[PDB]
Amino acid sequence: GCCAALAAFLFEYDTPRIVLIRSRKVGLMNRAVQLLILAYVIGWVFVWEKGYQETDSVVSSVTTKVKGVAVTNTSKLGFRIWDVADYVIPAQEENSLFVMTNVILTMNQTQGLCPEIPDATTVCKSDASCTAGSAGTHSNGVSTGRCVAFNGSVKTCEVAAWCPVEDDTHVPQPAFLKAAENFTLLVKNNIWYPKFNFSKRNILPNITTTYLKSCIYDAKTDPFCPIFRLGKIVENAGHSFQDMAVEGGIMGIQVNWDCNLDRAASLCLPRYSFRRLDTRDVEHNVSPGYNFRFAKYYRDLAGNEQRTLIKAYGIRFDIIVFGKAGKFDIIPTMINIGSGLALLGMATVLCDIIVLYCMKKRLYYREKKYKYVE
Amino acid sequence: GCCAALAAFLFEYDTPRIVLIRSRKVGLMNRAVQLLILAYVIGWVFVWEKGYQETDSVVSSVTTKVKGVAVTNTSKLGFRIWDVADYVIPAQEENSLFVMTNVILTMNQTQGLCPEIPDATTVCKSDASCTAGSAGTHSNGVSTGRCVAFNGSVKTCEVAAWCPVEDDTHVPQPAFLKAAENFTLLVKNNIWYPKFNFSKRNILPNITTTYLKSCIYDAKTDPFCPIFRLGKIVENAGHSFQDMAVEGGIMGIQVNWDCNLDRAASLCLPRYSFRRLDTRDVEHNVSPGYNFRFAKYYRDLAGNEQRTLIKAYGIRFDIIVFGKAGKFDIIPTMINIGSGLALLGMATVLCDIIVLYCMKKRLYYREKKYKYVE
Amino acid sequence: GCCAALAAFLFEYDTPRIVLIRSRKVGLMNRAVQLLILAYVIGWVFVWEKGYQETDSVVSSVTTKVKGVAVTNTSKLGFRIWDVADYVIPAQEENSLFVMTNVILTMNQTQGLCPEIPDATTVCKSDASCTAGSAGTHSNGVSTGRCVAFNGSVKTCEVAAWCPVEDDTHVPQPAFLKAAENFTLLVKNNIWYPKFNFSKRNILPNITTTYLKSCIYDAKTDPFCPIFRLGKIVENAGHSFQDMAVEGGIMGIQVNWDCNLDRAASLCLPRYSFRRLDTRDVEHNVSPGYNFRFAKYYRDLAGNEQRTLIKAYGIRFDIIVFGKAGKFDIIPTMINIGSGLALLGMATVLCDIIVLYCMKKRLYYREKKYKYVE
Ligand SMILES: *[C@@H]1O[C@H](CO)[C@@H](O[C@@H]2O[C@H](CO)[C@@H](O[C@@H]3O[C@H](CO)[C@@H](O)[C@H](O)[C@@H]3O)[C@H](O)[C@H]2NC(C)=O)[C@H](O)[C@H]1NC(C)=O
Ligand SMILES: *[C@@H]1O[C@H](CO)[C@@H](O[C@@H]2O[C@H](CO)[C@@H](O[C@@H]3O[C@H](CO)[C@@H](O)[C@H](O)[C@@H]3O)[C@H](O)[C@H]2NC(C)=O)[C@H](O)[C@H]1NC(C)=O
Ligand SMILES: *[C@@H]1O[C@H](CO)[C@@H](O[C@@H]2O[C@H](CO)[C@@H](O[C@@H]3O[C@H](CO)[C@@H](O)[C@H](O)[C@@H]3O)[C@H](O)[C@H]2NC(C)=O)[C@H](O)[C@H]1NC(C)=O
Ligand SMILES: CCCCCCCCCCCCO[C@@H]1O[C@H](CO)[C@@H](O[C@H]2O[C@H](CO)[C@@H](O)[C@H](O)[C@H]2O)[C@H](O)[C@H]1O
Ligand SMILES: CCCCCCCCCCCCO[C@@H]1O[C@H](CO)[C@@H](O[C@H]2O[C@H](CO)[C@@H](O)[C@H](O)[C@H]2O)[C@H](O)[C@H]1O
Ligand SMILES: CCCCCCCCCCCCO[C@@H]1O[C@H](CO)[C@@H](O[C@H]2O[C@H](CO)[C@@H](O)[C@H](O)[C@H]2O)[C@H](O)[C@H]1O
Ligand SMILES: CCCCCCCCCCCCO[C@@H]1O[C@H](CO)[C@@H](O[C@H]2O[C@H](CO)[C@@H](O)[C@H](O)[C@H]2O)[C@H](O)[C@H]1O
Ligand SMILES: CCCCCCCCCCCCO[C@@H]1O[C@H](CO)[C@@H](O[C@H]2O[C@H](CO)[C@@H](O)[C@H](O)[C@H]2O)[C@H](O)[C@H]1O
Ligand SMILES: CCCCCCCCCCCCO[C@@H]1O[C@H](CO)[C@@H](O[C@H]2O[C@H](CO)[C@@H](O)[C@H](O)[C@H]2O)[C@H](O)[C@H]1O
Ligand SMILES: *[C@@H]1O[C@H](CO)[C@@H](O[C@@H]2O[C@H](CO)[C@@H](O)[C@H](O)[C@H]2NC(C)=O)[C@H](O)[C@H]1NC(C)=O
Ligand SMILES: *[C@@H]1O[C@H](CO)[C@@H](O[C@@H]2O[C@H](CO)[C@@H](O)[C@H](O)[C@H]2NC(C)=O)[C@H](O)[C@H]1NC(C)=O
Ligand SMILES: *[C@@H]1O[C@H](CO)[C@@H](O[C@@H]2O[C@H](CO)[C@@H](O)[C@H](O)[C@H]2NC(C)=O)[C@H](O)[C@H]1NC(C)=O
Ligand SMILES: *[C@@H]1O[C@H](CO)[C@@H](O[C@@H]2O[C@H](CO)[C@@H](O)[C@H](O)[C@H]2NC(C)=O)[C@H](O)[C@H]1NC(C)=O
Ligand SMILES: *[C@@H]1O[C@H](CO)[C@@H](O[C@@H]2O[C@H](CO)[C@@H](O)[C@H](O)[C@H]2NC(C)=O)[C@H](O)[C@H]1NC(C)=O
Ligand SMILES: *[C@@H]1O[C@H](CO)[C@@H](O[C@@H]2O[C@H](CO)[C@@H](O)[C@H](O)[C@H]2NC(C)=O)[C@H](O)[C@H]1NC(C)=O
Ligand SMILES: *[C@@H]1O[C@H](CO)[C@@H](O)[C@H](O)[C@H]1NC(C)=O
Ligand SMILES: *[C@@H]1O[C@H](CO)[C@@H](O)[C@H](O)[C@H]1NC(C)=O
Ligand SMILES: *[C@@H]1O[C@H](CO)[C@@H](O)[C@H](O)[C@H]1NC(C)=O
Ligand SMILES: *[C@@H]1O[C@H](CO)[C@@H](O)[C@H](O)[C@H]1NC(C)=O
Ligand SMILES: *[C@@H]1O[C@H](CO)[C@@H](O)[C@H](O)[C@H]1NC(C)=O
Ligand SMILES: *[C@@H]1O[C@H](CO)[C@@H](O)[C@H](O)[C@H]1NC(C)=O
Ligand SMILES: *[C@@H]1O[C@H](CO)[C@@H](O)[C@H](O)[C@H]1NC(C)=O
Ligand SMILES: *[C@@H]1O[C@H](CO)[C@@H](O)[C@H](O)[C@H]1NC(C)=O
Ligand SMILES: *[C@@H]1O[C@H](CO)[C@@H](O)[C@H](O)[C@H]1NC(C)=O
């Protein structure tokens, strides 16, 4: 009878048979282990580590602006002005901004043949050591194989390059644009959690326009002003701005958006920290500091090309936005509940071992617990 | 006998003893709860949320190109041409592209001393309010401490800057390059899932060269043409291009690559949406819109430096590529199967509570279920 | 008595009753399935796939520098020098670097009216086909509606553009800057795992300054030199540099930082691979290769604007840094242990099916296992 079998399946309840052993020590140990498992599963997995939540990584867009002007007026270059259009190269970058702090300039370079800067490698005599096509470490020009006179006292290998070649052996000390220490950087950050489709920007709802006109970030007094002074950025990373400005470097401004979207959106707040991203190691490094070369191009009255070559040392400020949002989800919750239910059986296993192998009456309990089918 | 014990361990099967209670209500409730747990575990965890899959985040590379030219011919600037080399600054960017839509120009600036633009802060009389070294909000020059004549009717504080200083108090209305509304942007996207080592590009296999010569993206008619009109990009985000072009802004073009790699690769398709990334808030904002300054550098016949300063307003288009791929994995599958097996015992727990504490014959069932070892 | 009930709850141990069936086949199958589940849970989940670890994605910062100079000296352009400031456009980029390998130049362009380059679309006669405002495919200028003479033998539509218009119909072959094959690229990479707060850079502790002065990356001999030759980068991706240099392309240099932070930090090492990111498909592509336009701006003696337009073909090198770190965590460990404990019951289920439905004495075992409460 299939119908009778189905009715029996539906209208009967099956529960296991249990043996109740009266022992203070074993019972207390069983309860202690069960309490130890429950405390783990609740306090650590759920309350502490939030095992009931799904997570999503942040999607960020950043806008950066620098303010400040430096005035130098020396003999070689004369009176010079350095505003934002002069010391920010290139005009725009993604999640980054370079500020020039030291400079070496070479004005009126033309394409042609010229001697190199005298040193151990380039200095020559009799046009014998020079090798055609050898660019050398400079890699600024291609050697023509001839050995010409740099000046009245030394002879160097001739190269095909923009001439005269740059001389970068004397980096200015202190940094040329050392006034950049008091420039200020604004960081505007818009974040997005696509999974929860949640958006926020780092200028909080209580941060007004009047306040943003004169604020400077401070970890204690102004923890949410998005305007940072460069010297203070370097100082908060554990370094010195004047030391770092001579040869340049990389500075990380990292924004943490760890948020709990179970609570009010007003508590999803950014946290700022600062970390130097380049390393000082004179024995395990190549191209220390931070610099690059760019040029300004001109034209002679006859149409011949001329350029000013700039070797720009400076600090690159990288904006690093990271963080995870969390919202309650039923799948991790049920996974953890089932895991705890399964783990509650380790107490039974351990107590069975004790009852059956480390007891005086273990044979009696073995007889009571196990039935041999014969 | 160790061998006898091992044989007993290997050649015996152990199964629990079960009590079968005949009750329609309790049995039906047991089956209902078991069915409720099975339906959860299958339908929600496996079928709906794909709990049998491992996931991997996308690695993306983007190439962007703009097409279009604008012709303006006014009195101050005369006849001007704006092609791609003029309104895209810088020539290249990563996952981004800036299009200039409004402009303020200052031609023939030289480094020197000049008065500021008259306003409440800068206007002065008798050379008393001026403070040396105070850059002011302009931060375009350093105040020299002298109060000089801007013109015949007002006196302002003298600054060391590129002179004459920029006057950005009258932003053109409507936008200067308002013809950028009909420029078109091409977005080429190559994606990579390293875990599954799967690659695809957003130009699908059925998208031909002839079609790509004249297509424009439409959510309904051309959902896979990677060529977007700028005005339409802004419109699909819920905004107006002409309004946004006066002061600039940030526009997000986000590409979603949510794919199921259990199926054919032909179904891994990109989905396009548009979202404005900057905020309009006159009470809780600093530096609204989007603009930056860059310069073109020239040289006098005597070698003196001159520059044209450009304050460029425009819209930055950010390409945001996100998504996760999914493939069947055995580890999550077995974790979910074990979790469901463990969770099936909640029905037993609940039915035991009912049988032992909320029944008329609960004492009889308690006697039948539990054995006291004495 | 509540106290008596509590004492009974605390001082009693409950364990299930078991039926022991003596059968070689069923017992052996039970043990085989249990061993098969244990081998899975240990070997695959724990030992092989490291199911006892939490993971974290890498946060990376990259610095790139190119070295090399090319000398060309032809008739149209004359003697030219191309150093780093000439062929890297823009001076700086994020996680990227473009090297120019082919070039088309247009010198002395002025804003005005000029004919187009003769072709099927532009050629005209009698000033009838020309349409005012139609930018055309060139989109370099706006058509004025007039049909003027390109030269003595053909007439084309007049446009408002920078004049004369660029002629990009003859891309140089072989590439103009084909000497870029032996340029070298340095990639400095600093990584950070915020969850474990672990930092490392790709210049390893045993990589000295003397070694870095002359090393070139090789997968077999120098697997940790961060200096790559461009031609070799393209070759290791399965392509030819000279072929790729004519029209340009995108090359991916991907750094893998898969590390196990349970072990010494000295074993967290970078792995380098190379993949071309652009596709060759003459039937399913738009804008093949890789190129962009930028200009150098000059000024006439009268102050009129002039520019040199450069169409730059080249290879964009993208630095793709990915990887996950792993450290032992107790939560995944306990989840997997509980899952295995739950999964160990499938053996009992299967063996019960066999014992109760596929046995000669199945009725006797059914009587021994199940108790009917009456
Ligand atoms: C805008 O709303 C935010 C969110 O609540 C306010 O942030 C709060 O700012 C105060 C100080 O401005 C913080 O108190 C400080 O705590 C540190 C210890 O970390 C202590 O050293 C300082 O002396 C000071 O007491 C407060 O912690 C912070 N709230 C949170 C949740 O971080 C903010 O004040 C509001 N207004 C502005 C202008 O930001
Ligand atoms: C190339 O292959 C793709 C992949 O199948 C084709 O995509 C399909 O495109 C059609 C229209 O071109 C879509 O139909 C449209 O559906 C919307 C509703 O979302 C409706 O409003 C429209 O009127 C139209 O019926 C179709 O959904 C879409 N397939 C998928 C899976 O999204 C494409 O058509 C092929 N050819 C080209 C030139 O893209
Ligand atoms: C610095 O420390 C690293 C870390 O151990 C050293 O890496 C080791 O480099 C050698 C060769 O320089 C590798 O051996 C090579 O193995 C390949 C097979 O993949 C074989 O084809 C080669 O012939 C060679 O035997 C070795 O695998 C590698 N160690 C690891 C863990 O990858 C490095 O040598 C040290 N010094 C320098 C200058 O890098
Ligand atoms: C996220 C966490 C996941 C884990 C969740 C765990 C929830 C599990 C609930 C289990 C409920 C146990 O339910 C209760 O168990 C005890 C033993 O413990 C039973 O009690 C039984 O054994 C005890 C101990 O020997 C005897 O004193 C008693 O006479 C006998 O009835 C109760 O009759 C039953 O009502
Ligand atoms: C190749 C030769 C064979 C290789 C053999 C591989 C090893 C096989 C032995 C694995 C034995 C697993 O042992 C199995 O453990 C579970 C608990 O997990 C016991 O389960 C029983 O007792 C435990 C406590 O002891 C309770 O928590 C549980 O509710 C109850 O059902 C089973 O009665 C036993 O069969
Ligand atoms: C991803 C999902 C994970 C969860 C997977 C769950 C699979 C578990 C399979 C369990 C199989 C149960 O197997 C079947 O159980 C029923 C009770 O339910 C037993 O039936 C027993 O109890 C019932 C109910 O009181 C009585 O009517 C019957 O006389 C008695 O034999 C069957 O003898 C056994 O064959
Ligand atoms: C400090 C003082 C002590 C602190 C004590 C901490 C709490 C300890 C009590 C936790 C009790 C857990 O209770 C335990 O639950 C499981 C189900 O999960 C029961 O398990 C038994 O009955 C349930 C249904 O009721 C079945 O699903 C299961 O197959 C069967 O083995 C155990 O018989 C019981 O011992
Ligand atoms: C990450 C992995 C997670 C899974 C971990 C599994 C650990 C579980 C440990 C279970 C321990 C089982 O513990 C052991 O089980 C066997 C059966 O297997 C019991 O043995 C019982 O059944 C066998 C088989 O019919 C009989 O031969 C024997 O007379 C009887 O006592 C032992 O008395 C008990 O000590
Ligand atoms: C709408 C009509 C009703 C819809 C019904 C939905 C289906 C309900 C039936 C699901 C039955 C689940 O069946 C349940 O399986 C577990 C194992 O998983 C059995 O559990 C028992 O036997 C198995 C082996 O067979 C052992 O591993 C386990 O330790 C023991 O407790 C239960 O005795 C049985 O009740
Ligand atoms: C920059 O410094 C130079 C001197 O180093 C200044 O030029 C001199 O200024 C003094 C004081 O006014 C005069 O007496 C000299 O005649 C000036 N010329 C020289 C060659 O010394 C110069 O003025 C400074 N820059 C500015 C903007 O004033
Ligand atoms: C950055 O600004 C500080 C002031 O905030 C400068 O230090 C002060 O300079 C003035 C002169 O301009 C002195 O009178 C003060 O004694 C200095 N110290 C303080 C605490 O005010 C500092 O020189 C600036 N950095 C530069 C110019 O590189
Ligand atoms: C830009 O507009 C100006 C006028 O605003 C044009 O110059 C005038 O054009 C008219 C019509 O041909 C002439 O009669 C005038 O003599 C021109 N000069 C002036 C000062 O008005 C100018 O032609 C326009 N740009 C172009 C490219 O044509
Ligand atoms: C962008 O293009 C549209 C056309 O697609 C321009 O609007 C049309 O302009 C022409 C004149 O060129 C008028 O005759 C039409 O009536 C206009 N509307 C339509 C629907 O065609 C629009 O002006 C352009 N945007 C600019 C120039 O900023
Ligand atoms: C670039 O090539 C040209 C010729 O193609 C060189 O100019 C000629 O060089 C020869 C050999 O010295 C002379 O005899 C000719 O008088 C030169 N002029 C011409 C018009 O041919 C030129 O020298 C080469 N570039 C450099 C830097 O030498
Ligand atoms: C890149 O460098 C290689 C050498 O490493 C050049 O090939 C050699 O060129 C020299 C002449 O300069 C010849 O004598 C050799 O026979 C060539 N082969 C070898 C194996 O040395 C190659 O021409 C360079 N690429 C360029 C110039 O595009
Ligand atoms: C020539 O140059 C070298 C190196 O710069 C220098 O040491 C030497 O004094 C110079 N000779 C003269 C006469 O200036
Ligand atoms: C996310 O929420 C915003 C605000 O409610 C809404 O405009 C947007 O469409 C939402 N995104 C999705 C994918 O629904
Ligand atoms: C550029 O063109 C102008 C006229 O437009 C001419 O006067 C000048 O000489 C030219 N210069 C060059 C270098 O071709
Ligand atoms: C001087 O400049 C101010 C501000 O631009 C202006 O209001 C005033 O009319 C000017 N004076 C003369 C005589 O033009
Ligand atoms: C991924 O697949 C492609 C195409 O089959 C292959 O060229 C590449 O080597 C694969 N990657 C790995 C890591 O095996
Ligand atoms: C630049 O050099 C050229 C010769 O190469 C010379 O005629 C010109 O006067 C120089 N100009 C400057 C500003 O040095
Ligand atoms: C005019 O230009 C066309 C296209 O460049 C060319 O074919 C033709 O020969 C030219 N005419 C003369 C006389 O050079
Ligand atoms: C990470 O470790 C470094 C080195 O010990 C330390 O300077 C830094 O503060 C640590 N980060 C955190 C968040 O503790
Ligand atoms: C630029 O200004 C200088 C004086 O500073 C003057 O000699 C020159 O003619 C001006 N040129 C233009 C184009 O305004």
Instruction: Let me know if residue A197 belongs to a domain.
Output: yes
What CATH number did the domain enclosing C365 receive?
1.10.287.940
Cβ neighbours, 10 Å, residue B329: 14
Residues C358 and C322 in one domain: no
Is there a domain that residue C151 lies in? Answer: no
**Cα–Cα dist C89/C100, whole Å:** 8
- Residues 305 through 344 of chain A touching chain B, CB cutoff 8 Å: 330-331, 334-335, 337-339, 341-342
| Helices and strands of chain B, counted as H and E runs | 9, 19
| C-beta of residue A321 within 8 angstroms of C-beta of residue A189 | yes
Q: Which chains touch A (3 or more CB pairs under 8 A)?
A: B, C
Domain check: are A353 and A279 in the same one? no
**Chain A contact set for B371 (CB, 8 A):** 17-20, 368
* Residue A143 φ/ψ, nearest 5 degrees: -65, 135
Is A249 found in the same domain as A343? no
Q: How many contiguous H segments (helices) and E segments (strands) does chain A have? A: 9, 19
Decide if A99 is inside a domain. yes
In a domain, A175, yes or no: yes
| Element containing residue A61 per DSSP (H, E) | strand A59-67
B185 and B313 in one domain?
yes
Strand runs (DSSP E) across C204-248, as ranges? 227-229
Q: What is the DSSP annotation of B13-61? A: EEEE-EEEEE-HHHHHHHHHHHHHHHHIIIIIIIIIT-TTEEEEE-EEE
For residues C102 and A236, give the distance between their C-alpha atoms in angstroms, rounded to a whole number: 46
With beta carbons under 8 A apart, name residues in chain C contacting B335.
335-336, 339
Are B174 and B213 within one domain? yes
The two most distant CA atoms of chain A are separated, in Å, by 119
The reply to whether C38 and C85 lie within a common domain is no
Residue B141 domain-assigned? no
Q: Are residue A238 and residue A356 in the same domain, yes or no?
A: no
Asked whether residue B247 falls in the same domain as residue B185, the answer is yes
Is the CB of residue B258 less than 8 Å from the CB of residue B247?
Answer: no
In a domain, B34, yes or no: yes
**Among B178, B177, B290, B315, which Cα is nearest to B234's?**
B315
CA separation for the pair C93, C316 (Å, rounded): 11
**Hey, is B232 helix, strand or coil?**
helix
Kindly report whether the peptide bond that precedes residue C194 is cis, defined as omega within 30 degrees of 0.
Answer: no
**Resolution of this structure in Å:** 2.3
Contact A34, C22 (CB under 8 A): no
DSSP state of A83: -
A255: closest CA among A211, A291, A292, A217? A217
DSSP letters of A101-161? EEEEEEEEEEEEEEE---STTTB-SSS-S--TT--TTT-SSEEEEEEEESSSS-EEEEEEE
Q: Which domain holds residue C14?
A: 2-52+329-369
CB B144 within 8 A of CB B132: yes
Distance from CA of C315 to the nearest CA of A (A): 19
Boundary-marking domain end, from A291, A310, A326: A326
B9 CB burial (10 A radius; 0-12, 13-18, 19+): exposed
| Domain membership flag for residue B160 | no
Using alpha carbons, select from A317, A296, A309, A289 the residue that is nearest to residue A173: A289
Q: How far apart are CA C334 and CA B271, in angstroms?
A: 39
- The SS3 of residue C299 is strand
Nearest to C101 by CA among C357, C302, C278, C291: C291
Distance CA(C372)–CA(A17), nearest Å, equals: 12
User: What angle, 0 to 180 degrees and rounded to 10, lies between the N-to-C axes of helices C330-343 and C24-39?
Assistant: 160
Distance CA A179, CA A183 (A): 8
Q: Which residues of chain A are within 8 Å of residue B339 when distances are taken between CB atoms?
A: 334-335, 338-339
A307 is in an annotated binding site: no
The closest of A220, A201, A221, A224 to A212, measured between CA atoms, is A224
Distance CA C283, CA B240 (A): 36
* Cα nearest neighbour of B108 on chain C: C303
Which helix (H) or strand (E) element contains residue C101?
strand C96-115
Are C217 and C303 part of one and the same domain?
yes
For residue A188, list its beta bridge partners: A63
Closest residue to C194, CB basis, from A96, A282, A322 = A322
* Contact with chain A for residue C359, Cβ under 8 A: no
Task: Please tell me if residue B75 touches chain C, with a CB cutoff of 8 Å.
Answer: no
CB A332 within 8 A of CB A52: yes
Instruction: Among A295, A311, A326, give the residue marking a domain's end.
Output: A326
Q: Measured between alpha carbons, how far is C209 from C371 in angstroms, rounded to an integer?
A: 82
- Evaluate the CA torsion angle B276, B282, B283, B285 in order and state its sign: positive
Q: Are both C259 and C312 inside the same structural domain?
A: yes
Nearest to A191 by CA among A65, A64, A58: A58
Indicate which technique resolved this structure. Answer: cryo-EM
Claim to verify: residue A346 and residue A242 sit in the same structural domain: no
Structure tokens of C35? Answer: 């061993």
Question: Do C367 and A373 meet the contact criterion of CB atoms below 8 Å apart?
Answer: no
The answer to the question of residue B147 being in a domain is no
Complete DSSP assignment for B169-196: SS--SS-TTGGGGG-EEEEEEEEEETTT
Q: What are phi and psi of C244, to 5 degrees?
A: -75, -20
CATH code, domain carrying B218 = 2.60.490.10
B:211-230 residues touching chain C, CB 8 A cutoff: 212-213, 226-227
Directed axis angle between helix A330-343 and helix A24-39, to 10°? Answer: 160
Q: How far is CA B125 from CA B32, B117, B156, B158, in A?
A: 90, 15, 8, 12
**Residue B332 CB partners (closer than 8 Å, separation 6+):** B51, B52, B53, B54
Same domain as C203, residue C84: yes
- Could you tell me the end-to-end alpha-carbon distance of chain B, in angstroms, rounded to an integer? 30
Exposure string of A63-97, with b = 16+ CB inside 10 Å and e = fewer, is bbbbbbbbbeeeeeeeebbbbbbbbbbbbbbbbbb
What's the domain count of chain B?
A: 2
Q: What is the 3-state secondary structure (H, E, C) of C43-77?
A: HHHHHHCCCCEEEEECEEEEEEEEECCEEEEECCC
Is C341 within 8 Å of A59 (Cβ atoms)? no
Q: Is residue C211 classed as helix, strand or coil in its secondary structure? A: helix
The CA-to-CA distance between both ends of chain A, in Å, stands at 30
CB C256 within 8 A of CB C271: yes
